[PDB]
Amino acid sequence: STIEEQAKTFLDKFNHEAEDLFYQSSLASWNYNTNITEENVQNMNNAGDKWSAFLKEQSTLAQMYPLQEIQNLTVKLQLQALQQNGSSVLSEDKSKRLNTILNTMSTIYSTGKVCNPDNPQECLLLEPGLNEIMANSLDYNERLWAWESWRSEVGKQLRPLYEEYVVLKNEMARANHYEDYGDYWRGDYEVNGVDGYDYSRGQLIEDVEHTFEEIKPLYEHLHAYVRAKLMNAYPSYISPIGCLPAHLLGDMWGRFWTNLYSLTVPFGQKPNIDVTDAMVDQAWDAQRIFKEAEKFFVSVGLPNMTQGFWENSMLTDPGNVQKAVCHPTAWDLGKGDFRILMCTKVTMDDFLTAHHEMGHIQYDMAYAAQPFLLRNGANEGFHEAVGEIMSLSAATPKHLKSIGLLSPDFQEDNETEINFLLKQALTIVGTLPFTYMLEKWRWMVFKGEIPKDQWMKKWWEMKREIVGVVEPVPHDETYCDPASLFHVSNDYSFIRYYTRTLYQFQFQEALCQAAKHEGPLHKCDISNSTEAGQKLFNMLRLGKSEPWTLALENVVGAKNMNVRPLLNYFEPLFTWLKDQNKNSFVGWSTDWSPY
Amino acid sequence: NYLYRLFRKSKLKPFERDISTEIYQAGNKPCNGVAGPNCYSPLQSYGFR
Numbered sequence: 022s023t024i025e026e027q028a029k030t031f032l033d034k035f036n037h038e039a040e041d042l043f044y045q046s047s048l049a050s051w052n053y054n055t056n057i058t059e060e061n062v063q064n065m066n067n068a069g070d071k072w073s074a075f076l077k078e079q080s081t082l083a084q085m086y087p088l089q090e091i092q093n094l095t096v097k098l099q100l101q102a103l104q105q106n107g108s109s110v111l112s113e114d115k116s117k118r119l120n121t122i123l124n125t126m127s128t129i130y131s132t133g134k135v136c137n138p139d140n141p142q143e144c145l146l147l148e149p150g151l152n153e154i155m156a157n158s159l160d161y162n163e164r165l166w167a168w169e170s171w172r173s174e175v176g177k178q179l180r181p182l183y184e185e186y187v188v189l190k191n192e193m194a195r196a197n198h199y200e201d202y203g204d205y206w207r208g209d210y211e212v213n214g215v216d217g218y219d220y221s222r223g224q225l226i227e228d229v230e231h232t233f234e235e236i237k238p239l240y241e242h243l244h245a246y247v248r249a250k251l252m253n254a255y256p257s258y259i260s261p262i263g264c265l266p267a268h269l270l271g272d273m274w275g276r277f278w279t280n281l282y283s284l285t286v287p288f289g290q291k292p293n294i295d296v297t298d299a300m301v302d303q304a305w306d307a308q309r310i311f312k313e314a315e316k317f318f319v320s321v322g323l324p325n326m327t328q329g330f331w332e333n334s335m336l337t338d339p340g341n342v343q344k345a346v347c348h349p350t351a352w353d354l355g356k357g358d359f360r361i362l363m364c365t366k367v368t369m370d371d372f373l374t375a376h377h378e379m380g381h382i383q384y385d386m387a388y389a390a391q392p393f394l395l396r397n398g399a400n401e402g403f404h405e406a407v408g409e410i411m412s413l414s415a416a417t418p419k420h421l422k423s424i425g426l427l428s429p430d431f432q433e434d435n436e437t438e439i440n441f442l443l444k445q446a447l448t449i450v451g452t453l454p455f456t457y458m459l460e461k462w463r464w465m466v467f468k469g470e471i472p473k474d475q476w477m478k479k480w481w482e483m484k485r486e487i488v489g490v491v492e493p494v495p496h497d498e499t500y501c502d503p504a505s506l507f508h509v510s511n512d513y514s515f516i517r518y519y520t521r522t523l524y525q526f527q528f529q530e531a532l533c534q535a536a537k538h539e540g541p542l543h544k545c546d547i548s549n550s551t552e553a554g555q556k557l558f559n560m561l562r563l564g565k566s567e568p569w570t571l572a573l574e575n576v577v578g579a580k581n582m583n584v585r586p587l588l589n590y591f592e593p594l595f596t597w598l599k600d601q602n603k604n605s606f607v608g609w610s611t612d613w614s615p616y
Numbered sequence: 617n618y619l620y621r622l623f624r625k626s627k628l629k630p631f632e633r634d635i636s637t638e639i640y641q642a643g644n645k646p647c648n649g650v651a652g653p654n655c656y657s658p659l660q661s662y663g664f665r
């Protein structure tokens with residue numbers, strides 16, 4: 022009779038037909054991803070079309086229920102998720118132009134081929150070749166040529182496209198009652214209507230700043246050490262007082278620093294904790310790897326894996342005749358169907374990645390009971406954090422000695438700990454200033470704080486001021502240097518990695534104090550502790566029904582992002598970096614002194 | 617071909633059966649027999665796979 026009961030009945034109808042159509046869509050997407058054949062392509066296209074059509078008509082019928090007179094938080098959250106107009110709020114011409122722009126950005130990024138002048142008979146693509154040269158080569162001018170050529174070509178062909186893209190997305194966000202597209206992206210963390218756990222769209226930027234201000238000493242020490250080692254690698258090009266050259270960061274864009282472990286090793290004489298040899302000697306197939314991951318998850322208290330998971334998942338590469346996507350992906354088909362698409366091999370890596378994806382599947386299983394439109398993470402960071410904590414716990418020397426991969430007489434001295442923490446720092450602490458800088462640049466360019474003709478000059482300045490990386494040559498506005506990255510060219514949010522990074526170590530501290538660990542945080546294992554699995558499961562079951570602040574209070578006892586677990590994780594490495602940076606200068610200058 | 621009743625005005629008594637296919641009127645406006653906004657057919661299909 023009231024609006025709320027109408028909303029409940031409409032949501033029941035929507036949930037039933039949504040789960041059926043979503044299952045058909047996910048099954049067709051799975052059949053395309055495990056079997057790349059043209060009939061599977063057209064089946065996936067038809068199912069995706071019928072799903073987008075359904076979610077469109079149902080959103081049209083869903084916007085007839087105003088939210089101000091609904092008091093139930095679950096119904097309000099589901100209707101808030103359903104009533105989003107996306108790109109439909111514009112006119113048909115502008116919407117079609119926006120989709121055309123997005124498609125052509127995708128095709129330019131995917132099929133972008135940049136090669137050497139005077140040798141045009143064949144050319145090199147980004148994914149097969151550019152990652153290799155930019156991640157393994159030690160030649161300065163070769164990396165400079167590849168870096169400058171790719172950014173030059175892609176920037177000249179993508180700058181007017183991004184120029185129209187920012188305007189169209191800004192109009193889309195402002196028609197959808199948002200300040201800018203940055204506010205639209207920050208709206209995922211917004212919590213409204215719950216007392217005490219309220220979180221605003223605008224608060225995220227200062228929270229990120231407040232965490233980064235405490236990130237800065239550790240990052241500065243790491244930067245100084247990396248700079249010194251690269252000075253050993255490249256003698257005259259890098260300055261003691263200046264920033265790092267941009268094409269020497271181990272990746273195409275400087276997102277990860279994990280490719281510098283060979284050059285920046287603390288103790289090269291000590292071996293690593295690679296256990297691939299023990300797996301290949303004892304014949305650990307992919308099935309037993311997933312069974313060991315299952316054993317870890319039943320050790321911590323979470324449910325076992327379903328029968329349909331073992332029956333329907335393709336945990337091995339099928340062969341040459343049948344082509345499949347090799348990307349590790351966890352699939353939540355729905356209707357109680359959970360699968361993992363992973364071309365598993367025998368490696369320490371794929372073992373950790375299997376733990377990561379099974380963490381994803383456990384997260385998807387806990388929240389299954391929830392309604393369909395709330396079957397997601399509370400924010401975009403929790404879903405990857407709950408897999409990365411499993412990847413953290415499974416890589417410990419204690420866990421490898423428990424399951425027999427590592428010898429029981431293995432001596433864990435401080436040098437291998439320093440080595441492990443530095444690899445983890447290059448992978449984790451290295452991506453934080455780049456992520457914060459890129460997201461803050463995107464927020465200001467959507468907000469209009471950065472003038473249209475001042476993009477590159479502002480971006481490079483921030484790279485000098487935040488990341489401590491200098492450009493090789495000056496770039497004018499004919500280039501679009503941010504747009505060379507996959508996430509920004511294809512309309513993806515980037516702050517999820519920063520939030521995931523913080524939530525990872527927060528969850529890790531909460532579980533390790535729950536499991537009574539008496540040593541340093543990096544040695545901790547959550548195996549056989551059921552109180553820690555229960556503490557985590559109290560957050561996993563919620564899904565998106567509760568605020569992410571409430572879920573964080575459920576796990577770590579705090580309702581806001583904290584940077585203390587990350588610095589507590591890297592504390593011995595922090596002391597070591599303080600000890601060996603006495604001769605060198607910590608910190609950087611924004612001048613162009615290296616190049 | 618397997619259906620279940622999702623919408624009914626009142627709860628069922630023990631050992632009772634309802635075969636009615638009447639459009640469930642969830643709002644204030646009469647449905648008039650034709651399916652439309654706030655008017656849902658009560659029998660939903662069990663799409664078994």
Ligand SMILES: *[C@@H]1O[C@H](CO)[C@@H](O[C@@H]2O[C@H](CO)[C@@H](O)[C@H](O)[C@H]2NC(C)=O)[C@H](O)[C@H]1NC(C)=O
Binds near residue numbers: 104106110196197198
């Ligand atoms: C999504 O788009 C629809 C269609 O424009 C919006 O519905 C209109 O809202 C305005 C303002 O309240 C009304 O004056 C119109 O009469 C509505 N039209 C229809 C057909 O209902 C809807 O408000 C938009 N929702 C959001 C969240 O932006």
Ligand SMILES: *[C@@H]1O[C@H](CO)[C@@H](O[C@@H]2O[C@H](CO)[C@@H](O)[C@H](O)[C@H]2NC(C)=O)[C@H](O)[C@H]1NC(C)=O
Binds near residue numbers: 423546549
């Ligand atoms: C978690 O519990 C299991 C089961 O009790 C432990 O596995 C045992 O470890 C002891 C080590 O002294 C062996 O003697 C037993 O044979 C093992 N039993 C089985 C069934 O494997 C395991 O070590 C515990 N700890 C961790 C970190 O997994």
Ligand SMILES: *[C@@H]1O[C@H](CO)[C@@H](O)[C@H](O)[C@H]1NC(C)=O
Binds near residue numbers: 056058343
């Ligand atoms: C993959 O697709 C081909 C196309 O005909 C089909 O013959 C084959 O059986 C499929 N494989 C599986 C595992 O379904």
Ligand SMILES: *[C@@H]1O[C@H](CO)[C@@H](O)[C@H](O)[C@H]1NC(C)=O
Binds near residue numbers: 095
């Ligand atoms: C919200 O609705 C659900 C069912 O749709 C119900 O289980 C829950 O108790 C309701 N919450 C409140 C606060 O009324």
Ligand SMILES: *[C@@H]1O[C@H](CO)[C@@H](O)[C@H](O)[C@H]1NC(C)=O
Binds near residue numbers: 319325
């Ligand atoms: C499922 O977990 C229980 C413990 O909760 C265990 O005893 C049982 O063996 C597991 N099932 C399988 C098939 O291993």
Ligand SMILES: *[C@@H]1O[C@H](CO)[C@@H](O)[C@H](O)[C@H]1NC(C)=O
Binds near residue numbers: 435436439597
């Ligand atoms: C490791 O511990 C030994 C013994 O205290 C000490 O002499 C050595 O300097 C330490 N090394 C590092 C890298 O901390």
